[PDB]
Ligand binder design. Structure first.
Ligand SMILES: [Mg+2]
Ligand SMILES: [Mg+2]
Ligand SMILES: [Mg+2]
Ligand SMILES: [Mg+2]
Ligand SMILES: [Mg+2]
Ligand SMILES: [Mg+2]
Ligand SMILES: [Mg+2]
Ligand SMILES: [Mg+2]
Lengths: 101, 63, 305, 132, 204, 94, 122
RNA sequence: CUGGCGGUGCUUCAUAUCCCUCUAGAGGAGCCUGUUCUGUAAUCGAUAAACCCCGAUCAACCUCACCACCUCUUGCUCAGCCUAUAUACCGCCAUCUUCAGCAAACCCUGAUGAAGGCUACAAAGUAAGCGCAAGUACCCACGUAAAGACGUUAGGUCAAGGUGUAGCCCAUGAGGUGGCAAGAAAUGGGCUACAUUUUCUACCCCAGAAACGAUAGCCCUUAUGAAAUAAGGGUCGAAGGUGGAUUUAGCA
């Protein structure tokens, strides 16, 4: 029930990236290492490469939440400032308002 | 306007105060005073000619 | 006019309720109790002196609508109703008659206060003419009763804060009282602890001023207090520093030393120093990178293209 | 010409309500805070979800009450709930009001597992504050 | 017309009973006509009948000072009195100087869990427990950022686990294992070095 | 989607464009064929729980659409305007 | 209104460090007054201070789409109100927290209490 | 008669402003950053104040809704619609705005014409309403913050949501690898340095000399990983030559 298809793209990417993380971290740690020759390093590289596409946090693009709008989006609030700015103007945000100084 | 219309600079003259005038002194007292600067320190070594020479020779604000 | 009485009755009922129901059982509770209640059980979360909950006498807050000057059958009671602002014209006529009589014999308030006292409009030229008439009556050589009645409006002028007093000198530890002051200059801080009489050296946490100010202008700035007081070497110090850099810290230390010295210096010298300005702070902070610009103050380059 | 929440004047005959008659910068001067949640702190989590829930419940209560709202809502938070202070406009009958309130409460409780009990304030005429 | 217990309420009534449960302002049941609103150049703050500024306020009408005092005097029970432990935390440190920190934040909304406020240390004095006196020449330097200059705050912090009860259990087990493996010294316990001495031990 | 939802007065103003409401959709009677003790039955005096067939609800919706069409037709009702001197003008009109 | 006092061992808080965060000053003052009243009714002292705010401003473009000339200033404030307590039984502390949370201001006036237990030794 | 316009006359103001004075930088070369677009299977919207260090707060793919190759009728949405419509809007923002007026309801005048209504030693003007004003925050009420009103620019946006007409109905849609991130041709801006306090060192302001710039490559692709743009580690430790009007803000 998302607006644009980029929303579903990013949702699937995030899901398939969060599916597996233990092996990813293990192989990332095994990579950068002076111990053990390059044999096991290349073996682990081929293993991590054998994984399917999509399943990867690299493809995750932190956009907004309305219709995927990566334009000054705040990851702390996820959703863009489309409605957040409206609230900050009205006053529906406990604190987040115009910097009165 | 970075300078506030309330605060105003002081008067560093003091050699003359060693002996109308009382009214001027009271007026000077009744004035929003400020602190003196470090670059243009109007002390004993504040020679106007040499002061201006150094100010002009100032590069990158290193008086 | 009926609305004024209705609101007065409503305010009286509200006062009676807030007195009886709440713990504050005395009906003579002042506005301090209402302010405390507003601060506690009405966290407005604001700071406006107007929008905040202000429930007091309606006459003190409402622009009272002048009641009907005449009842039935018309006939305005005042003999100067068709002149607009009967009170102002009546006062002007009274002043003119007083001036004529006194001739035959041979600070002011603000428009807002007058409008609050009465309920008649007022312009600028009318107030100017009124001030002119007042000055004429005051400087035209008159009796005493009229002059007093005219000056009655010239209420207090408010004249407070002028000279400086002695700072906390602290008469403890020993007979030689030692003061504790502080100085600030452009986000700087420095507390100086100048002792009383005692020729020796001006120390700074063990380091002398000679070992702390390699510059000559810094030496002159640090000496200015003693240079003016003429007491070169007679007080010890143990000033501290926290924050700043070079000139800012120097100015803070200078201010702290000047305050600690004025704490035990002749009143005349203290006043002369305060006039010199070495006892206050100059709020001059570095620039602020504007958000709608590029650099510190330089706006966008080709924004107009 | 920026025109956020401030309304542009046209003629002195605009029956605007109280909250609607306030600029969007008076949040710290005249205008208060409608909705509140720890998400807008420095710094606590739980912000995006709270804002989404608030924006959804606002439209939900405005739709369930078509035209029966004298002005915008004023959300709140006390426990595992979300109190909604509204100035209802006397339009339908009290029986219908009670029925709809109970239905919405039960539906929200069985949907979000959070009893969002609201509060009403029946007022016939809209609280006109200014004639912009 | 004539709402219930609003303006016709008997004057001088128990205010604590007027707002027993936390609820919004509800101007239809408040005998205090507060003048809330912003004044116009020739206007007056809107009446109390409908002021959204009163609802935007978090509202503290419930639990007034008198009501707060009554509720406190009532809830004085449902608790357990504490013995004359003497304030200032001096005797507490003289006896049991153990002090494990723990905090808890607050959140608004459906969720209540907040695992972020789980910071916990393992501050337990070694000399106070009195079970491995031989560790004086060991734990004085084996542990990290300790060996203070002036004061003395021995804390074998080991926040490698989140919980607190299991933290204390692990602390007890670690003290036992340290006793065991220290009463049978390793190697360089006494024969330290020639340029690093926290406590004098031959040679030199 | 839900993010594509907002008010209706704004959409109406946008569709109109003049620069440079739930009557047919009842609120009381459920839009789904159902009977309840509240309304549509004796106001609490046979208070029970029943359900209407989807065909009955479709017929009710068709009746509401017919009411909307009747209102629209009423909006098309003509009026009498006396012609002043010149046709379709305010000449000698009163 | 029953004591319900048992005979099991309880925990004793050693120096209960308390801190309340809040944006504006009116709500914070109301909260601190309520807390001080509750503490005085319980019988505990407190101590406050005058800390500054927390300027965590975050600026972004003014218009939602094109245009970047002028930005917007958005930031939140917070004033720390320390009201640390000292010596209080576990049940008393629990009841105090319950009474404080039964009416805590949502969003504004965020509490930051830091407990310090002891846990008896072996 | 109203307005526009005048190298249109007179009078008063501009206080970094319009000049009579002064500062660091563009008008000399390389990396990043955009645009119209020739490569192309590669959205490109504004393209003189109102558009480009705007998605850029970053073009290995994610950004990319473009085709080389496959997909479907229930189209995750009772779809996608980025397929035209923003010169059809709601909504959002920009200059004038370095401003002070803008108006409902009334009255008077012009033999009762479009229209005008100012002379305080006072000749017809009264003016609720909005704004300047006023009021409010951190460190005060100052300094920093919010507003800069009616309106020209049919100012820009289907590109955050729907949107006046048309249509793809077995896609004009999006989803699986690839790609556009070098300049046919024109060019602004951020950094490297254009030399004697540039580059090197000590006294934490006790002095001089040759008279200096990996700017990019290659692997580990950092930061991750199906697959690698300024790189943390092994090869550029040199080479450029303050430029003529004009230009940006700046009273401490
Ligand atoms: Mg600048
Ligand atoms: Mg005709
Ligand atoms: Mg499309
Ligand atoms: Mg457009
Ligand atoms: Mg402007
Ligand atoms: Mg502003
Ligand atoms: Mg404003
Ligand atoms: Mg356009």
């Amino acid at each position: 029930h998302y607006v644009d298809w980029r929303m579903w793209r990013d949702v699937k990417r995030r899901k398939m990236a969060y599916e597996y993380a233990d092996e990813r971290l293990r192989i990332n740690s095994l990579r950068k290492n002076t111990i053990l020759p390059k044999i096991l390093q290349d073996v682990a590289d081929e293993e991590i490469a054998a994984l399917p596409r999509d399943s990867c946090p690299v493809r995750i693009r932190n956009r907004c939440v309305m219709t995927s709008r990566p334009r000054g989006v705040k990851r702390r609030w996820r959703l863009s400032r489309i409605v957040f700015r409206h609230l900050a103007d009205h006053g529906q945000l406990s604190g987040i308002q115009r910097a009165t100084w | 306007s970075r300078y506030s219309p309330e605060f105003k600079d002081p008067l560093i003259d003091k050699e003359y105060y060693r002996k109308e005038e009382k009214y001027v002194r009271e007026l000077k007292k009744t004035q929003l005073i400020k602190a003196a600067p470090a670059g243009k320190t109007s002390s004993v070594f504040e020679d106007p000619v040499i002061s201006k020479f150094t100010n002009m020779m100032m590069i990158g604000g290193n008086k | 006019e009926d609305f004024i009485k209705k609101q007065i009755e409503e305010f009286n009922i509200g006062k009676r309720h807030l007195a009886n129901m709440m713990g504050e059982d005395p009906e003579t509770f002042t506005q301090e109790d209402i302010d405390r209640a507003i601060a506690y059980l009405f966290p407005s979360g604001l700071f406006e002196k107007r929008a905040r909950p202000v429930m007091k006498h309606p006459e003190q807050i409402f622009p009272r609508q002048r009641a009907i000057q005449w009842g039935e059958d018309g006939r305005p009671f005042h003999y100067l109703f068709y002149t607009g602002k009967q009170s102002y014209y009546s006062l002007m006529h009274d002043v003119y008659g007083m001036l004529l009589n006194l001739e035959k014999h041979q600070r002011w308030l603000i428009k807002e206060e007058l409008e609050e006292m009465l309920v008649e409009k007022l312009s600028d030229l009318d107030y100017m003419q009124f001030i002119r008439l007042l000055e004429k009556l005051l400087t035209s050589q008159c009796g005493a009763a009229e002059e007093e009645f005219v000056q009655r409006f010239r209420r207090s002028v408010t004249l407070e804060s002028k000279k400086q007093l002695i700072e906390p000198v602290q008469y403890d530890e020993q007979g030689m009282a030692f003061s504790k002051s502080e100085g600030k200059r452009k986000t700087a801080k420095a507390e100086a602890i100048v002792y009383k009489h005692g020729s020796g050296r001006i120390k700074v946490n063990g380091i002398d001023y000679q070992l702390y100010f390699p510059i000559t202008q810094d030496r002159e700035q640090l000496m200015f207090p003693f240079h003016f007081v003429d007491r070169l070497g007679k007080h010890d110090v143990t000033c501290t520093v926290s924050g700043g850099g070079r000139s800012a810290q120097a100015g803070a230390i200078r201010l702290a030393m000047a305050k600690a010295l004025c704490s035990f210096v002749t009143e005349d010298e203290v006043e002369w120093m305060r006039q010199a300005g070495l006892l206050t702070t100059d709020p001059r902070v570095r620039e602020r990178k504007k958000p709608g610009q590029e650099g510190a103050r330089r706006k966008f380059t080709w924004k107009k293209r | 010409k920026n025109r956020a929440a401030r309304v542009r004047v046209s003629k002195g005959d605009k029956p605007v309500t109280y909250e609607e008659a306030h600029a969007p910068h008076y949040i710290a001067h005249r205008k208060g805070w409608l909705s509140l949640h720890t998400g807008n702190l420095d710094g606590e989590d739980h912000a995006a979800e709270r804002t989404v829930e608030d924006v959804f419940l606002r439209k939900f209560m405005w739709g369930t009450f078509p035209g029966c709202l004298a002005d915008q809502l004023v959300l709140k938070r006390r426990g595992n709930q979300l109190e909604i202070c509204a100035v209802v406009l006397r339009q339908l009958s009290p029986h219908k009001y009670y029925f709809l309130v109970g239905y919405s409460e039960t539906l929200l409780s069985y949907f979000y597992k959070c009893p969002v009990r609201l509060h009403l304030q029946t007022v016939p005429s809209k609280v006109v504050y200014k004639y912009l | 017309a004539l709402p219930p217990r609003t303006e016709k309420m008997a004057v001088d009534q128990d205010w604590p009973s007027v707002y027993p449960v936390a609820a919004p302002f509800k101007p239809s049941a408040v005998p205090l006509p507060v003048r809330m609103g912003y004044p116009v150049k020739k206007g007056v703050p809107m009446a109390k009948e409908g002021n959204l500024e009163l609802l935007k306020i978090p509202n503290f009408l419930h639990l007034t000072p008198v009501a707060i005092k009554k509720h406190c005097e009532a809830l004085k029970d449902f608790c357990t009195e504490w013995p004359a432990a003497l304030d200032s935390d001096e005797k507490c440190e003289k006896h049991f100087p153990i002090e494990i920190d723990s905090t808890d934040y607050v959140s608004s909304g459906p969720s209540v869990r907040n695992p972020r406020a789980r910071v916990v240390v393992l501050r337990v004095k070694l000399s106070s427990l009195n079970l491995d006196d031989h560790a004086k020449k060991k734990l004085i330097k084996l542990v990290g950022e300790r060996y203070c200059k002036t004061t003395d705050v021995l804390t074998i912090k080991t926040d490698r686990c989140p919980l607190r009860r299991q933290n204390y259990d692990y602390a007890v087990y670690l003290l036992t294992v340290l006793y065991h493996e220290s009463w049978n010294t390793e190697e360089w316990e006494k024969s330290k070095t020639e340029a690093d001495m926290e406590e004098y031990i031959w040679e030199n | 989607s839900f993010f594509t939802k907002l008010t209706a007065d704004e959409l109406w103003k946008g569709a109109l464009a003049e620069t440079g409401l739930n009557r047919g959709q009842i609120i009381g009677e459920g839009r789904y064929g159902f009977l309840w003790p509240g309304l549509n039955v004796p106001l609490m005096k046979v208070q029970t729980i029943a359900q209407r067939s989807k065909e009955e609800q479709e017929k009710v919706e068709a009746d509401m659409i017919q009411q909307r069409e009747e209102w629209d037709r009423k909006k098309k009702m003509k009026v009498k305007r006396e012609r002043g001197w010149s046709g379709n003008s305010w000449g000698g009109i009163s | 209104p029953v004591v319900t006092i048992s005979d099991e061992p309880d925990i004793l808080y050693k120096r209960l460090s308390v801190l309340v965060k809040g944006h504006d000053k009116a709500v914070l003052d109301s909260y601190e007054y309520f807390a001080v009243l509750a503490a005085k009714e319980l019988g505990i002292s407190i101590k406050v201070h005058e800390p500054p705010r927390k300027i965590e401003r975050f600026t972004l473009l003014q218009s939602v789409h094109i245009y970047k000339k002028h930005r917007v200033q958005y930031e939140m404030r917070t004033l720390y109100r320390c009201l640390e307590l000292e010596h209080l039984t576990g049940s008393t502390a629990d009841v105090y927290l319950e009474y404080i949370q039964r009416n805590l201001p949502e969003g504004v006036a965020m509490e930051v209490t830091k407990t310090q237990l002891e846990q008896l030794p072996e």
